[PDB]
Amino acid sequence: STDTFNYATYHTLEEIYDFLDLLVAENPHLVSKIQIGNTYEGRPIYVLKFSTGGSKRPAIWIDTGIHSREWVTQASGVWFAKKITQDYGQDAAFTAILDTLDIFLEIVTNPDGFAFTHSTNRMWRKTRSHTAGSLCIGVDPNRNWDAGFGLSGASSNPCSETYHGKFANSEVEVKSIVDFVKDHGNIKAFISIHSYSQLLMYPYGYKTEPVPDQDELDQLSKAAVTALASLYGTKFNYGSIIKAIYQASGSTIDWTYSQGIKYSFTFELRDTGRYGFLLPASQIIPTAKETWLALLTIMEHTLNHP
Template sequence: MRYEWESMNRSRCRMAMVTTGIFYACIIACFVAADQRSYDGYEVWRAEPRTMKDVEFLKDLGFTTEIDYWSEPTTPGKPVDILIHPDKERTLRSTLETERIPFHTYIDNVQQLILEQMRRKIEAKNSRELRSILDFDYRVYHDYDEVMEWMNTITMEFPNNVTMEQIAVTYEGRPMYVLKFLGGGDVDKPVIFIDSLIHCREWITTASLLYIFKEMMTNPLYKHMLEDANWYFVPMINIDGYVETWTNDRLWRKTKSTGSSSLCTGVDANRNWDSYWSVSGSSNDPCSNLYHGPTPESEPVIRHLARYVLSLGKIDGYLSTHSYSQYILYPYNYANITTPDYELQDSVGEKMKNAIYAVYGTEYTNGLGATVLYEFSGTTSDWTYDKAGVKLSYTIELRDTGEYGFLLPPEQIIPTGEEYLAALEVFKNELTTL
C-alpha cells in the first residue's frame, strides 16, 4: 500500500506550494494525518572519545540505555554519532560531561531533514506511466510500491536479460524478490550478488542501485558489465521495515517481527545470520536496535535468502550494501581476525576505493570490518565468506560521513550511484581475471 500521507494529501500539498512556510506546514500536516512519528526536537550529537576508556564507556552506555548510535564507538579519535531524544538530552549531556567526553551538536534539526526529503519527493512527483526504466525519476527516493513497479518494468523491458524470482515472504506477508541479470554467452562468467536495504532506514542503498542497474541496461559504456558477468540483485531485504520508514517511522532500523515474550518489535537483520551469531556487537535485549533475534536466522527474509544463496552453488563476489560512513569492509567482522584470503580481499577493496575516489574525490576507507568499524557478529559478509564460500565478500557503507547520516539528500543519489558503479566495474574486472 502506498504511504498514506502521499495518497491522501498530495493534492493539498501541491496547492500549498505558494511559500516555503506554507509548504512545510502542509508536509507536517500530512505527517500528522498519517501518524508519522515526529522527530521534532531531536538532534544528532557527535562525541569524540579520546581514550579506550571513553570508547568502552560509550559501548556500555549503548547496551544499558535506549541510545540510537548512528555510528558506533570503535576506537579513540573516531567520532561517534548519537541520535538524541529531547527528553534524554539533559541526562546524556550530564553523563558525557561527567565522563569528560567531548561532544557537540552535529545535526540540530533531524525533523527538518526528514521533511526536506519528503518535500523533494512531492515536488518531483508526476503521474506519467512507467513504460521504461528511463521514465523513472532517479533523483528522489521511492517507496516500496514504486520500487516494485521499477522491478516489474525492467523485467518486461528486458525479458531476454532480466528475470525476477520470489525467494521469500516477509513476516508481514510481503514477497521478497531477486532480480537476475544474465547476459548469455560464457557459462563460466563470474557471478556477482548484491543486496541492499537490510537496514531499512538506509534509503540510499536501494536508490543508488536502481540507478546503477539502469545504467548497466541502457548506457553503452556499461554494456560490458552484463556481457562479462551474471548479476543477482535483491533491491529490498527488510521490506516490512522499509514500509515502516515511509508510513510510521522514518528512522526505523529493524525488521517488524514480534516475539511472544517481548513488547518490543523487530530484529537487527544484520546480526541474525548464522555466522558467529551473538558473539559480539549485538544485543540479547529485544528492545535494542542491535537485537540479534531469539535464534540464528529467526527472520524469514534472512533464512530464505541464505537458502537461496546456497542453492546457487557458485558465487564469485558478494556485496551487501549499507550506509553510512564510506567504508569498504571485508571479513571478518565478528573479531579482529583475518581470513586466509585477506591479501586478495584487501587488494580488491583498495582498487574499489580508488575507483570511487576517481569519480568525485570522495574518500572511502578499506579494511577489515572488525578493525575499521567494530566487532559485530551474525553479519552477511561473514556468513557469505564462511558458509557460502564467497572469497570476495564485502560490506559497502555508502555516503556520507555524518553530515546528513541516514537522511542523505536526494540530490546525492545519482553521485553516490556513479561512485558505487565505478567500484562495481572494478570489482567485475577483478573477478574476470581470477
C-alpha cells in the same frame, strides 16, 4: 517507463516494485525477477537477475536496504538496475563482465522495515517480526546470520537496535537469501550495501583474526575506493569490518565468506555524518555513480580470478 522514472528522488516500496516490473518488461532477454520468499508481514521478496544466458553462470550478488532507514542504498540499487540495462551492449568493458558473470540484485532486502520507514518511523532499522513477552518489535537482519551468531557484537535484548533474534536465520528475510545462495552454488562475489560512513569492508566483523585472503581483499579494496574517488573525489576508507567500524557478530559477509564466497564485501555509502541516514535526494545519483565505479572494479576482478 524506466526512461521516464525519477532516479534522483526517494521512492516508496510500491514504486520500487513497479520499477522492477517495468525493467523486466523492457528488457525481457536480459532481466528477470525472482521471488525468493515472503517477509514476516507477507510482502514478496524479489531479486533481479541480469544474465546474457548460460546455466548457473558464476554470479555477483548485490543487496541494498538490509537496514531499512538506509534510503540511499535502495535508491542506488534502483539506479544500478537501470545502469546495467543502459550499459550492456554499449559499454564494452561492462558488456564483457555480463557476457561471463550473472548479476543478482536485491534492491529492498527488508520490505517490512522499508514500508515502516515510510508509514511510521523514518529511522526504523530492523525487521518487523514480533517477539513474545516483548512489546519491542524486530530483529537486526545484520546480526541474524550463522557466523559467530550470538557472540559479542550483537544483543540478546529484543529492544536493542542490534537484537540478534532467537537463532541464526530466524528471520525469513535472511533465510530466504541463505537458501537462494546455497541452492545457486555458483555465487563468486557477494556485496552487501549499507550507509552511511564511506567505507568498504571485508570480513571478519565478529573476530580480530585476519581472513586468509586478506592481502587480496585489501588490495582489491584499495583499487575499488580509488576508482570510486576518481569521480567526485569522495574519500572512502577500507579494512576488515572489525577494524574499520566495530565488532559485529552474525553479520552477512562473515557468513558468505565462510561458505567460500571469497569476494564478500560490504559498503557504507555517503556521507560521513553531516546528514547521516537523511542524505538529500540531490546526492542519490552521484553516490550511485561513484559506487558503480567501485562495483565495476570488484566485478572485473571476480571475472578474472575463478
